[PDB]
Paper text:
Volume-regulated anion channels (VRACs) are expressed widely in vertebrate cell types where they mediate the efflux of Cl- and organic solutes required for cell volume regulation. 8C-8A(IL125) consists of a 25-amino acid sequence unique to the first intracellular loop, IL1, of LRRC8A inserted into the corresponding region of LRRC8C. Like native VRAC/LRRC8 channels, 8C-8A(IL125) chimeras are activated strongly by cell swelling and low intracellular ionic strength. We demonstrate that the 8C-8A(IL125) chimeric channel is a large-pore seven-subunit heptamer, like homologous pannexin channels.
We obtained five distinct 3D classes for the 8C-8A(IL125) chimera. The 8C-8A(IL125) maps showed no apparent symmetric arrangement. Therefore, the final reconstructions were done without enforcing any symmetry and resulted in five structures with resolutions in the range of 3.4–4.0 Å. The most apparent difference between the structures is in the arrangement of the LRRDs. The arrangements of the LRRDs in the other three 3D classes exhibit diverse arrangements and subunit interactions. As a result, several different subunit interfaces exist between the neighboring LRRDs. The distances between the subunits forming the tight interfaces appear similar in all classes, whereas the distances between the subunits forming the loose interfaces are variable among different classes. The distinct arrangement of the loops formed by D50 and K51 is also observed in other classes. However, the number of subunits with K51 pointing toward the pores differs. For example, the class 2 structure has only one subunit with K51 pointing toward the pore, compared to two subunits in the class 1 structure. The groove created by the distinct K51 arrangement is located between the subunits that form one of the two loose interfaces in the class 2 structure, despite the presence of two loose interfaces.
Author numbering:
A (entry chain A): 16 to 59, 95 to 176, 234 to 405
B (entry chain B): 16 to 59, 95 to 175, 231 to 405
C (entry chain C), E (entry chain E): 16 to 59, 95 to 176, 231 to 405
D (entry chain D): 15 to 59, 95 to 177, 234 to 405
F (entry chain F): 16 to 59, 95 to 177, 231 to 405
The structure:
């Protein structure tokens, strides 16, 4: 369960996150494969040129120039992708779970389920003890939940954190992508034990990392666009008070009150999945149905 | 139960997509498990030639000519086929998982599945059956009232099919365009003279002859896929889908008072009647108030 | 499940297909695992010859001759087997997953399964629910017979698929027997790479020659058996009017001499289900007599 | 499953032997392509070493040539024959479950026996309803009309063991005949002189002394299998299978009115009594008219 | 189910056999990885010595001396251990399978269990449902007393299997003591390959010569312990007269001097079972006297 | 099931045994993976020395010195660790699976579990026919068990035997492990007589995985040391409380029923073991041991 509070901008984000994870794991796999750098000593019929270097001196040169000339971005790109995917997924999961605010969600889901299976909605639009108990417990839930600010402000905090993390990711990926290069000009001072001073190196997974970087940049661009749209949606209509106006006109009940804060936010969240549970809640919220039920009882 | 709303074209295209995925992954896995390019210098009884090159200079030349001589298509073909296969998969399944387009579909399928085991159909042409049938009538009436004005369950289908058609066209375009560039032996002209001593090289691409065959197979499969998509698009345009005609049904049933439904209900009725051209008649039975009149007359 | 509507051949050939697939993949296990063609230059007590070649020139020569000398059949043998096995598996399954050709299958299977367990079957030859149960199954039989007794849509596809399978069997035998003799162990390689290696003519050995030849012979045997089974089926479909069925012997045995003789698609499916168990036909024909309707209405009232 | 009751001791013994043969064959195949098969050196028809002056690929060429030009076909393709024959034994031992003729009758028989296996009427009548007992009876009477008409479910079990026995005989024949050709040191005389420089070679087959012991173990296993097959063939012949005699039941029961059946049902009774000797006694009680008449009289 | 019938030595020998299997498989899995032989030619400031041999002549020498210089015991140590361990496993739990050997044990276990908790035993030692239960107990007691008296089918097999285990012990310890000194580190390989390598005498080192040695000792030790247990079993099967049972102490303790002596298979089974628990014997003996039947008949009325 | 009958000192050792097993397998795998001894010849601007040895000469030298230069501890430490851990596990899991002394265990567990939660227990300690009948049956089961168990001494000798065996094993382990721990060193000197085969007589060798073993060795000792202490404590517990006899003193005073007897022998030892887990199961059992309870149930039957 728990999928009812999932607007269209919450499964798309999960798909984007899993795609980013796939990109990162592919990058790490390619990192572990291949021989990485390859360096040769620069000198500054067509017979070959004899460098006269042992088999271990090549390994020494390659290892020294792999951590002396390559830019720090070209060596730790998949790791950064993995870290950012991890933090995005954790931020997505942290809001809902919050070990200490989940019960308010499970009990609310149970309330929605019970109000969904009630067949009295049809009669109201135009076993009594069970309904009375349901009304009493719904009143208890209202009085218990309608007070605090714990389901709106922290959602905004999550979204703002996501947007700022995005802005930073775009910021430093845009600049540090022209430094992923194929051929580099390693220049070290190992002259008394190798014999050569200037070496030219050829990083292998350069173009592939450039393509992966472009793909990752586009995927984030879409993710940040989604999060920015959500934040703007939360900050141009002020979804803190819910006005039950159309329900009153299209239902006939004239005693429909308006709820405020967290319950209003949860109603706002629900309507994206199906704009019909508010119908059941409005029908169940009237005090005249219980009056008629007890009048019939007597 | 979603397979009912899946005509033959949308199982044939699904099998085509699966085959595309398998060929693409085969190519991708074969690419790595191979020695790739191999280059040698050019000298522009028999006795061998002494090049006097080290063991690392060979690797240097190989991995330099790999990215300085080979065409971009010959290197990233499995990746392209994987990407396009993934788009094709998440281009036809998107019309189901979009929020706001799922509740109507599940309600429709529930009503259709339920409106099959009703004795009234047999009797048309005991307390439980009457109340259950009345509940079915009320549910159908309210659902019809629901899906009558907001007609977003059909434009998405045409849009996605058009997207598939245009993607197919471009796929064919630049696969036929750049399929003759996958050659076996190539010439590499890189300027590394003070490092290795040779300026001109001749290279062989190990997987050049296999990639051509896989490209041809992919071209054939995508051509068949595009032909199916064009047929579906044509079927979606040769007569209005936002209306239905219970012409012969009313004539052969003698209940000629049922109105002709339109918009989303009509379109899904067109889609479903292809799978089984009988269910529509069942719906007719549970769209006439005359059945309710018979029920009330029998009760009263 | 969907196993009753399958004669012996349709459960025999199936095994062959999977067997074929195994051979296919088996080849693919080695075609990329074992070391491929090995080539040496040719110069046309005992002391060896110094060719004076590096270790990369050897790889160059090997993978150039591998594609400039070997026949196109010796390299792609497993892939053709895999493709043909897959397409046979597809053709044999173009029977249950084609909208417009599966509704009748499921209807008939469900009706047969529910009718075989009906008590009226054993009561005919010597309650409350059974009344309307038998009634409803009777209208279901009536509507089914009025439904699937006009067009042979589902009998015109079995013939099509079997004919295509026979044609493909012929093609496979033809071209596979044509080129089975070109898989050779030792070959000659005449490529003009002298400015880069110094040697013009090479002699090569293809590592997987005998193994491919033996696998090819096994594949030919399997395909021949497959084609013989398909030929038997084709002969089975044309030696009488398969589109008509007569309820004569059942009437003689039982005594209810009023069940009509069906034709077309339902007759075809009844023949198929008869090729598996000669008991279903009678158990269903007993629900086709007007006298049975009279007995049912007398019992109910 | 529900078909596990048709397994005498020898059938399960043969299954265990066959899985053991498969294990040996897969072990042999695993060792086949994991080592270097052959090692060949040229022959030259103070102590110092002698230099061949051969490259590192001419050794591979020589090894690969002499491996398929000097080794007997038995030493190379040994494990595959073991796998083929184990697979064929597995197939032959089960070619009477999948045939439609035998598949239907076995299922019907097991269903009838299972239905009779949970009938409290038998326990009540022996130790100390209606339609279920009555209906089960009518099935039995017609059951011994469909089954006792020909040799279908019994002819297979006698026509397959003969094939198994003959296949065992031929296996022993050409496996003992060609076990002395697995040599360790062999000679190779190939005419490759203008390419390598040496004409005569001496070769060692690394996996020679192990294939001999594997062959001996395989011969022992197949010999035990063949002894089992001969035992079951003799058991199928020393006394008639087409007839079953209800002899001891008459003395141990006293209800001397049960007739004796023949043919496929007789063979099935033979096998089931070879199984746990408790199904026959339970099933025989549904053949006496006395119990049915008593039940009818009591009910009416 | 049948574990209650297993005395201590059965589980002890089972654990020992499992340990033998463990060490054998450990030896085999160490051999598969690192087992090899290193051979060098012999020449019967400081500088190194040049042998002037390629990388293939070393492999030739190694794999020739590996089978012309190593004793067959060192080559295959763990395979024999595995074979013998499997033989011991099959020898154990052998008499449980060849005969029926399922009813004769399970029924006895069930009767002993339901005789253990019979309230009549407690009533005597200090409705109709109890009467019929006791009658059933007595009648099946007599039924098995008469039925099983046919020979020795659950007794001779035990002696046969113990004897076979003892003989396996004797032979195994014999030839493992005989050959344990044939495993060495350094060996001399005198093979005649002179025109192909140039060297006639070689000295070779075996990798796991000091390992297979130590393991062997451990293995031997385990076997030794095994044998002792088996010997004890033979002492138990040879000293006590298991073919007859004598109900002596019950007569003096209870005073009801009418219980007859049981013999043969039931005597042996009681001798075996009383080891697990010396209380089931008296519970079984209670239901063997005619006075108990007389009391049962009197109470039934 | 087998949880209540396990004091804390029998679960601390359970954790320690698995810790030792994992350390041993870690050592074994790190041994099988990495390279063994590496040896070089000795010569008993700078320029390198050319030994002039082939690639198989070096393998021969390494393989011979690995066995002619290394002390047997540095060679086979981890298998000793594994053997001793397995022996400890066998010792600790002995009396649960020894025929002739295991049936009593589940009999006692079942009886105690049955009488732990019964309405009659609550009713009797406060001051239907089915409940009375089941209580009566449980009374007979307890009465027969008392005579079934309260006569032998087999479940007490085995416990002390296994504990003393574990203690002596711990002593031996610490003894020789401490003795042979300074012989696991890094650089060793190899002196083999091969002059006609390789050309060099004296070699110097380095054992690759030496220091690591030493580290592991110390860890092992610590665990064993702790293990020993635990065993010692248990060995002290058995020999100072007089575990043979059990007194129902506290139960009588806090319940008032002055007819519960003092049990001895095997049953007393089992009660001593169980009350070390939670000291109220004894009360629930003692409820089902009073003739007063039998008389009360007999009266309530009427």
């Amino acid at each position: 369960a728990f999928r009812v509070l999932k607007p269209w901008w919450d499964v798309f984000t999960d798909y984007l996150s899993v795609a980013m994870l796939m990109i990162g794991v592919f990058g790490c796999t390619l990192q572990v494969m291949q021989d990485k750098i390859i360096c040769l000593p620069k000198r500054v019929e067509m017979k070959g040129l004899k460098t006269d270097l042992d088999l271990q001196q090549y390994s020494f040169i390659n290892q020294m120039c792999y951590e002396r000339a390559l830019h720090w971005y070209a060596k730790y790109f998949p790791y950064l992708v993995l870290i950012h995917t991890l933090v995005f997924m954790l931020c997505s999961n942290f809001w809902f779970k919050f070990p200490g605010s989940s019960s308010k969600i499970e009990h609310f889901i149970s309330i929605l389920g019970k109000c969904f299976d009630s067949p009295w909605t049809t009669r109201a639009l135009s076993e009594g003890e069970q309904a009375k108990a349901l009304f009493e417990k719904v009143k208890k839930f209202r009085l218990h939940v309608e007070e605090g600010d714990i389901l709106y402000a922290m959602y905004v905090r999550q979204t703002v954190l996501k947007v700022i993390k995005f802005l930073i990711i775009i910021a430093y990926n845009s600049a540090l992508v022209s430094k992923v290069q194929f051929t580099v000009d390693c220049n070290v001072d190992i002259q008394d034990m190798t014999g050569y001073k200037n070496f030219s190196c050829n990083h292998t997974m350069a173009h592939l990392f450039s393509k992966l970087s472009f793909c990752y940049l586009c995927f984030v661009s879409i993710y940040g666009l989604t999060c920015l749209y959500t934040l703007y949606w939360l900050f141009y209509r002020s979804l803190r008070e819910y006005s039950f106006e159309y329900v009153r006109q299209e239902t006939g009940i004239d005693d429909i009150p308006d709820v405020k804060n967290d319950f209003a936010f949860m109603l706002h969240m629900i309507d994206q999945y199906d704009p019909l549970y508010s119908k059941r809640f409005a029908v169940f919220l009237s005090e005249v149905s219980e009056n008629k039920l007890k009048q019939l009882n007597l």
